[PDB]
Amino acid sequence: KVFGRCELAAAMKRHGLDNYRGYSLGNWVCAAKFESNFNTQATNRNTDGSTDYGILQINSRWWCNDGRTPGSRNLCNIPCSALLSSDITASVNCAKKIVSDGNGMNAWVAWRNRCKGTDVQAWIRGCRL
Ligand code: NA
Ligand code: NA
């Protein structure tokens, strides 16, 4: 599923990501745009051989099991394929652990490099939220 911008904002806020660990909703929408272009089916191999999955490009080296990643920890106790569902619940729940890991949203390098320090509220402007 390719979500619309305000569609994803509403889904993210219903699951409680707005101001989660102090990150306003625009941060999460900005991150999703640049990680996945709002596409739940997005997958991208990383150099280290792991793969990033889903709307928030959650990594198989530490968070989910994809059966092919040397050193996998599967801290969200989920198959990575479950992160590709049209329902973003599994992704949100695992992202809540990632953002609690100590580095905040810097865990998403796209957020650090393309959202941090920008007007991220722009990503929810116009959304009936
Ligand atoms: Na992609
Ligand atoms: Na919670």
Side-chain angles (χ1 to χ4, degrees):
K1 181 177 154 83
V2 178
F3 273 75
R5 172 176 69 92
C6 292
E7 187 182 7
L8 183 60
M12 268 177 166
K13 147 159 181 160
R14 155 184 85 256
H15 281 104
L17 276 195
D18 183 27
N19 305 306
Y20 189 92
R21 291 281 272 131
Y23 287 95
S24 69
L25 194 56
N27 290 276
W28 299 100
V29 176
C30 182
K33 162 78 181 173
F34 294 128
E35 289 284 5
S36 74
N37 206 21
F38 300 148
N39 180 9
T40 70
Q41 299 191 257
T43 59
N44 292 284
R45 193 73 137 271
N46 307 123
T47 64
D48 69 341
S50 70
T51 305
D52 288 344
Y53 293 86
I55 185 55
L56 283 165
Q57 290 287 277
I58 288 174
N59 185 257
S60 62
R61 158 98 56 180
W62 305 90
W63 309 103
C64 60
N65 177 38
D66 72 356
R68 73 176 191 190
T69 285
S72 168
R73 256 283 192 297
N74 192 10
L75 300 170
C76 297
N77 281 118
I78 193 178
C80 298
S81 67
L83 292 187
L84 307 172
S85 175
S86 68
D87 181 334
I88 70 164
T89 300
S91 286
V92 174
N93 280 353
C94 187
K96 283 183 187 168
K97 307 188 183 303
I98 299 165
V99 79
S100 300
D101 189 47
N103 289 305
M105 284 202 63
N106 296 292
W108 288 270
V109 290
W111 177 86
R112 177 181 180 270
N113 286 336
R114 321 189 44 191
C115 304
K116 183 184 195 175
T118 75
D119 169 27
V120 297
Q121 180 87 6
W123 284 102
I124 65 176
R125 186 153 47 241
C127 304
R128 173 72 137 275
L129 275 169

